[PDB]
Amino acid sequence: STGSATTTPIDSLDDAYITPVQIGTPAQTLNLDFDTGSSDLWVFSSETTASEVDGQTIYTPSKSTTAKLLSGATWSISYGDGSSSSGDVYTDTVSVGGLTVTGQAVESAKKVSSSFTEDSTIDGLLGLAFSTLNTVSPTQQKTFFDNAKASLDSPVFTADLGYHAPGTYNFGFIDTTAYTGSITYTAVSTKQGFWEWTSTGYAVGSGTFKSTSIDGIADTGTTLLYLPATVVSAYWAQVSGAKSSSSVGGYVFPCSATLPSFTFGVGSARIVIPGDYIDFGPISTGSSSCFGGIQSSAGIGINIFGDVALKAAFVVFNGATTPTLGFASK
Template identity: 45%
Template sequence: MKFTLVSSCVALVVMTLAVDAAPGGKKLSIPLTKNSDYQPNAKAAVSKASAKFNKKLINPLKGIPGGITTDGGSGKVPVVDYGNDIEYYGDVQIGTPPQTFKINFDTGSSDLWVASTLCSSCTSHTRYDPSKSSTYVADGRAWSISYGDGSNASGVLAKDTVTLGGLAIKGQTIELAKKESSSFASDPIDGLLGLGFNTITTVAGIKTPVDNLISQGLISSPVYGVYLGKASQGGGGEYLFGGYDTTKFTGSLTTVPVDSSQGYWGVSVSSVKVGTNTVASSFSGILDTGTTLLLFTDSMAKKVAAVYGAKDNGDGTFIINCNTSSFKPLIFTLGGATFNVPVESLIFEKQGSTCFASFGYAGLPFAILGDTFLKNNYVVFNQQVPSVQIAASINQ
């Protein structure tokens, strides 16, 4: 999980998204909508990612063979584009009758936790009330999450029905927050739903929501397609569980093997180019919807910055020329195909006449392909193989 936000007022504009998903079966889609008010902060985005992954450094990732299937069922959940592409969240219902929460979907973690009435200080959030759910089952085991930046949350486990886009997952283990730090209290989201593998749940042996969507037959294909919108194009987006949305990408999907041995969606990147200039080759990366920026290793980031004439701020961020007319896109090669981060996505934040780059570094031995990459490329995640399929998003 990663939070990259500061306190702000949230204005939500709900938009309806057309879906032409994989044929047949049950599908769950979560659309994303736009928030127009948030002011981005590149330094905060880097520090949050550093805190997220430095707490558990992993070995460089190596791809493993696999393929993706698209037969079977799915369902859709819309998500809000918060803070001009800072993070994306959708409505999730918990309990009977359902209580609705704003939940951040994060492929870089695997826990489902939510603010609850057990937390007296969580008053800025919608809080899950177990006394109002007839399907609530107490567990009592403790959980705790803490991050290198000092943010933390803790509480107890429980079980209840969790509904995603109309599909009701029965007996889903949830983590009820009894305490949370001030940084979480100022975030607009009420909780987080991890889409990583179950080997990195905070309490061992818990099935993730995707595990249960598959095992309970709510989706008949073990995949989910992710489309992240851009604020510059109206924002929004969707998570489509059990299939993928052919209207959200162009060209054909390319299969890329995934190394899930560390619980993450690890991929091997053959190269990164700026135009015809190769700036990095043969490195490992993580596909993470919960990281805002595109983060390279320290040495790789400096090489990318040099090509664009960007200035290192010494804190993981770079100042970049606001006039990008002479720039060329970043080109990633995965699975033998190329995927772009276009020129307009190279600027993340503008403060007066100063622009901050959407790429940086966080002292990690691998790259994080965060929302800067993912909002330009549609990704189908296959949990069973495991593998991903990637194609250029309609945003490009």
């Protein structure tokens, strides 16, 4: 089997991407944030505290003939940005882009933090990291990909995120028309439950490539590119007037600036992030100070190849017995 779904930026900055997901019988379609940095599929629901729902589409398990309470199971998650959610669990039929999993754990939110309430466009998350990070207790549950894997033509999914435009998540096949050149594959460590890999270095604009190992995770659920402070300083030093602002919470730059590209290494191959991808606009409406899309990972504890990096590539998440990651230009 295979599946293919379009993923759409939630706003003009590509702050996140939403992908329609069918849950239950008859289908209830929710727009979920596909997140390769977590492993819970959770949704706004009929059980969510009413004061914490503001425009989201909710899953109502009582209206699904295939929903079954997973008795005794609860979940609770916190994300790197400080947001969180928690609740109980149903199993139900879940389909993405024509690909159907029966018995998928659908984690129903009873509580969500302010960040989620305030974002009307995201109805929940669909985790695509390794199932070892799934938070369901006392019986840990499998991700949608893990459940689908054995049925898929090939045990892979791909992320093809657009810059200021829609893109595609495919399951079970590699669309050879979706990228240019060849795909370069690189080793993955699953020891922390992430799609963790090692970049071979970086370049700033037309500068010389610096060969250096950068351990990080491929994370579709993080907006920006978070790298070591040395690397990030080297980038922003090429932008006149750029500076790290503790009050704003990262590097800002004059909105009048032209940003250089940023290149990262995948084995001997190179992915170029155009400068435009690194502009996240005025820090506040009408400001001439703009927020940078490359930020320091210092104090996160891990480097994160978020959407800023991933949308510059066609990315293969290979879930074979020994997982790997593939990157191609597009």
